[PDB]
Design a protein around this ligand. Structure first.
Ligand SMILES: *[C@]1(O)C(=O)Nc2ccc(F)cc21
Ligand SMILES: *[C@]1(O)C(=O)Nc2ccc(F)cc21
Ligand SMILES: *[C@]1(O)C(=O)Nc2ccc(F)cc21
Ligand SMILES: [Mg+2]
Lengths: 304, 301
């Protein structure tokens, strides 16, 4: 038993991280087949930005301006091209450690692991959720741009995130692997801020089911409620609305435990109103919203 | 930036996880060079959990009784010996993915990453600490025995934990990679319980320093304390005694922030007395005790 914030094994992604330098700017790139993917702002230098068209700066750059380091072997850049906010560097040699992979875009509330890297070298791995305000609460280290977020299915790595910037409130913003930003952000050095965040209701419920599976039951009660009644309570406590799809998703946990979703919502509605009264749930005095229903099932199953 | 509980990249350990089967018992093994390390209770049947005679069970085993499987490939066992509570299976093939490694026995309060595995296949990685009662609060299902805990410092993997059992309270017990259990536990199904768990005081202090470094100061106060007066108060909240070694270890962080160690102790005393009053420190509503002084220093704080 036990429940922990659990990231995917990062080995398949570790074999993909390379160092990318252009001028003084050094960050991380993702080496798959013969392409290195990295944030396009690597080519920006503190003097040239005069309301630029990015392809103006890019067409001034030669292949040899891109120093790509895979550990110690230097990768020869033989082409460059822009894909939204991502820069695609064609290299002469394919990555022999390229895993089976796909580029996917995730929805807010979905979770993924991040392999925090510095100068092409993996430093740590953590599990996080795409917040409703399209940010993620991530790592401390500078020079982490180009670190990627991913999920693993069986053998297949689904890349969903590349880190681009830090926001003034300590959170991070990034794109999918096709360079499309998550959220209303731009990859320039201008003043931006995250919008007011909300709590991922369906994930909190999934975490409550995990607590029940692990013997934490004190918050259960005899009552049930309506999706209407609960969503009115959720909106006042800055919780995402709970849709009928969310209830269906929680179906398996509702069957494994005997606690119906609206039955469990009655427990959550009491918790939002009256608090925990000094008690904890799974060793926490806050309501955790960074476990999806399938995170709970996976961890309380044994999927490998 | 934000302060995050980060596990080590698990790739170097992933390449060493294998599956070990004896009879109907299957668990995970650690394959390093030409040795596979695994918990010795893999040779226990049903009638062996309460009073296993491991020497008796082991003397009746041949090499071909041990089925080691690395991915799709079966490994051939050519020798076996027992070292304390771990089995050491010599195999015919050195693991080509063996990293630079060492075996380290850790002390309470130390942190490490755990690669949870099932049937020799890695399933997830998370960060743990050795509790003062020599247990860990992991996440382990049946089949996860033989999963290992480790740190990675400069491409060298230091293996410090191998999982052996779950206690009644839902916490977990295991050994170092030389097979010596952490704490007073044994690989018997007999009644044994963990000592009352306490808070790792030196870790909470270091976490408070990290909060100051990250710009959070609301919990500081005017007072200092003597070391002994601090420990008298903290024992009342089931906090671990703070030693002079703990004071010295925090020296760098005190210097970095200009807050004397015994000054931070006084603030922790007041936090215990006052609670948080709905506030948070580094995003948490409880006092976090699974970041070591070392962790916060090289978290570039
Ligand atoms: C460059 O100044 C930078 O850092 N980001 C970016 C985006 C688009 C552009 F045209 C230039 C830059
Ligand atoms: C990015 O290049 C990186 O690695 N760190 C960082 C900090 C701030 C920023 F605007 C961009 C980056
Ligand atoms: C461990 O070997 C495992 O995988 N399951 C299990 C159950 C009970 C026990 F004492 C040890 C283990
Ligand atoms: Mg109820």
């Amino acid at each position: 038993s036990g429940f922990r914030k659990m990231a995917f094994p990062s080995g398949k992604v570790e074999g993909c991280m390379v160092q990318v330098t252009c001028g003084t700017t050094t960050l991380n790139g993702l080496w798959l087949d013969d392409v290195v993917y990295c944030p396009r702002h690597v080519i920006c230098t503190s003097e040239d930005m005069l309301n630029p068209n990015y392809e103006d700066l890019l067409i001034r750059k030669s292949n040899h301006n891109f120093l790509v380091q895979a550990g110690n072997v230097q990768l020869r850049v033989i082409g460059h091209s822009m894909q939204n906010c991502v820069l695609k560097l064609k290299v002469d040699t394919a990555n022999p450690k390229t895993p089976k992979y796909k580029f996917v875009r995730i929805q807010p509330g979905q979770t993924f692991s991040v392999l925090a890297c510095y100068n092409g070298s993996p430093s740590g791995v953590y599990q996080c959720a795409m917040r409703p305000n399209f940010t993620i609460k991530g790592s401390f280290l500078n020079g982490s741009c180009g670190s990627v977020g991913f999920n693993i299915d069986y053998d297949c790595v689904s890349f969903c995130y590349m880190h681009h910037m830090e926001l003034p409130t300590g959170v991070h913003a990034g794109t999918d692997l096709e360079g499309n930003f998550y959220g209303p952000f731009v990859d320039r050095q201008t003043a931006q801020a995250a919008g007011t965040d909300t709590t991922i209701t369906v994930n909190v419920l999934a975490w409550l089911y995990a607590a029940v599976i692990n013997g934490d039951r004190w918050f259960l009660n005899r009552f049930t409620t309506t999706l209407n009644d609960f969503n009115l309570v959720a909106m006042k406590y800055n919780y995402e609305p709970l849709t009928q799809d969310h209830v269906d998703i929680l179906g398996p946990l509702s069957a494994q435990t005997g606690i119906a979703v609206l039955d469990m919502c009655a427990s959550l509605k009491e918790l939002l109103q009256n608090g925990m009264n000094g008690r904890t749930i799974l060793g926490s005095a806050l309501l955790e919203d960074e476990f999806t229903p399938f995170d709970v099932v996976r961890q309380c199953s044994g999927v490998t």
